[PDB]
Amino acid sequence: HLEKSAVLQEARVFNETPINPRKCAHILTKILYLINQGEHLGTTEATEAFFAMTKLFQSNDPTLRRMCYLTIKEMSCIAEDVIIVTSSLTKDMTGKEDNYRGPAVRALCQITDSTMLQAVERYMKQ
């Protein structure tokens, strides 16, 4: 029905100044689809994504948030970086609903380093 290569370039367009929440949501869906049926993965592609995903964060939009989690969740055993996320993470944590919080832990857990742990323990206590 649809194909990966083009898409792989195109996903970053959401990352391009483009405002249209829907559009990107869809595009994200596809990626996930490619993935769902089966997909190669790798770093370069990831890294570029790493800068790409990252800017996009003045979104308030809750649902918008959802989408993110999922994606990130995708990266786990093949995960890349955490520090950026920290702030982000923190944001879920302080973040009003409850919701935000659960997804974040969930990606985190195959992937992470002892170290930070201590800190995040507190959160755990909570």
Partner: protein, 159 residues
């Protein structure tokens, strides 16, 4: 405008930031898990990247590029220590070359009683007059006063 506010975690950049941004502050540690923030000033629509610089990321602080056009470089004024030499020069030069396409406005923080060693020496050392170059301002602040803040933005909101 992707305007990057730079400096370390522990600076108390963040303090400033929200002081301005929200009116209200937050700890003298700049962020660990970033800021991207949007501010309208003069109703003009701005993105603040606030870095609690911290090394590993610091190394990678280049880490992003696209849509870059403005610098708040927060440097702590009274910082007698981490400010110049190799580090300072390196950072500046690297940044400059890489994104010769953005004005560099350096922010000197917690000036309190200034606990620097000469406003003059440093500005020169940074080659502030190596100028023949992009809109520049050398600007003094102690955070609590916010000794020069509004101009930075203001003068900036110049075109």
């Amino acid at each position: 405008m992707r305007i990057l506010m730079v400096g370390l975690d522990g600076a108390g950049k963040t303090t400033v930031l929200y002081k301005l941004k929200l009116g209200e502050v937050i700890t003298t540690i700049p962020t660990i898990g970033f800021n991207v923030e949007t501010v309208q000033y003069k109703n003009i629509s701005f993105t603040v990247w606030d870095v609690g610089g911290q090394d590993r990321i610091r190394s990678l602080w280049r880490h992003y590029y696209r849509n870059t056009e403005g610098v708040i470089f927060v440097v702590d004024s009274n910082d007698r220590s981490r400010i110049g030499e190799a580090r300072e020069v390196m950072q500046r030069m690297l940044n400059e070359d890489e994104l010769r396409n953005a004005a560099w406005l350096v922010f000197a923080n917690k000036q309190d009683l200034p606990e620097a060693m000469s406003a003059a020496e440093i500005t020169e050392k940074l080659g502030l007059h190596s100028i023949r170059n992009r809109p520049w301002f050398i600007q003094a602040t102690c955070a609590t006063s916010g000794e020069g803040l509004y101009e930075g933005l203001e003068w900036l909101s110049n075109s």
